[PDB]
Amino acid sequence: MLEKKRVSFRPMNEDDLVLMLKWLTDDRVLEFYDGRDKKHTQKTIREHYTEQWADEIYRVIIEYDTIPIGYAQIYRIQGELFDEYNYHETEEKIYAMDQFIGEPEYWNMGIGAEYCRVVCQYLRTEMDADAVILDPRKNNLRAVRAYQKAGFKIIKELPEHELHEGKKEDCVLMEWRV
Ligand SMILES: [Mg+2]
């Protein structure tokens, strides 16, 4: 209302799969998301990024000044996903999220943190969310710090949680609460 809101997001559609291919064949992006040992193709992108591997999944495109610059997937934690995050089963509505900025000229600008704040507020007010959780690699300092700036708190360590570029990486469970 005072300044123009620059960070936004929109639902992903099938036309966005060409951006996903670009981002996930860019070694600069793969260094931080999925890994430079992943060899993506139109086929793998269409398979991974259209799969209904949880009951409630949303895929979104992160935007800056209307420019599409990254991707997020948001899903409700239910069933065995609780055990995957080492998060206790609860009747509260818990969402998990993964995200990346695929356009490196927009890194280190506060966009990821602002995207996290905007989507957390959307989940709270539109989806009746009680909490959002994340599991970044503990040594992905850029991500951890952005999540902390958005109000996520580390609630425990997740040892040997992710294999990334051949190394079993400890992660941290981070939580944002309503
Ligand atoms: Mg994750």
Side-chain angles (χ1 to χ4, degrees):
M1 183 187 296
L2 188 61
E3 254 329 288
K4 195 161 218 324
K5 201 75 208 302
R6 301 182 83 156
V7 179
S8 61
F9 67 85
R10 59 163 175 80
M12 188 186 89
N13 61 65
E14 284 175 3
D15 290 328
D16 299 319
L17 294 170
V18 303
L19 299 180
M20 296 294 285
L21 180 60
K22 188 179 85 83
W23 294 333
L24 295 183
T25 59
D26 187 324
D27 280 344
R28 303 170 301 165
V29 174
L30 291 174
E31 173 164 4
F32 298 103
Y33 191 88
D34 223 9
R36 285 166 290 180
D37 51 338
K38 308 291 184 188
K39 294 310 176 177
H40 281 291
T41 63
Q42 171 184 284
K43 183 168 160 205
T44 69
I45 293 292
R46 155 90 61 194
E47 283 190 19
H48 294 109
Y49 292 103
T50 63
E51 178 188 42
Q52 274 294 323
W53 55 261
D55 278 354
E56 174 176 5
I57 301 169
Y58 308 102
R59 292 173 172 94
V60 303
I61 295 298
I62 305 172
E63 304 164 301
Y64 183 81
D65 293 352
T66 80
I67 300 165
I69 63 166
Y71 167 87
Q73 47 188 36
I74 293 112
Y75 52 106
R76 190 170 174 188
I77 298 303
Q78 284 166 319
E80 55 191 357
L81 294 185
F82 281 114
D83 279 332
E84 300 192 14
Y85 282 84
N86 296 17
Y87 197 96
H88 52 19
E89 206 158 0
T90 165
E91 289 167 29
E92 305 164 298
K93 281 191 80 166
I94 311 301
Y95 286 88
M97 191 169 38
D98 303 296
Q99 53 272 317
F100 67 87
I101 295 176
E103 294 294 335
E105 303 308 301
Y106 300 82
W107 291 351
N108 197 21
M109 290 182 66
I111 290 165
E114 182 62 14
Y115 162 74
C116 287
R117 299 182 187 103
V118 167
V119 69
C120 281
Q121 286 311 310
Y122 186 98
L123 287 171
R124 185 192 81 158
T125 70
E126 296 305 301
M127 315 300 311
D128 289 328
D130 293 300
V132 180
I133 57 173
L134 312 172
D135 58 352
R137 288 185 310 278
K138 186 191 185 314
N139 60 29
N140 186 359
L141 241 175
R142 170 150 52 198
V144 175
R145 294 286 177 262
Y147 302 153
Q148 284 171 334
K149 286 196 178 48
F152 288 79
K153 295 170 201 63
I154 294 174
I155 60 181
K156 55 176 163 192
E157 263 177 66
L158 302 162
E160 288 183 0
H161 198 247
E162 180 185 311
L163 186 70
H164 185 73
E165 299 189 344
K167 156 99 150 127
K168 289 179 292 289
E169 294 284 4
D170 299 341
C171 298
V172 289
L173 184 56
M174 302 185 75
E175 178 195 66
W176 174 85
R177 279 228 173 258
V178 176

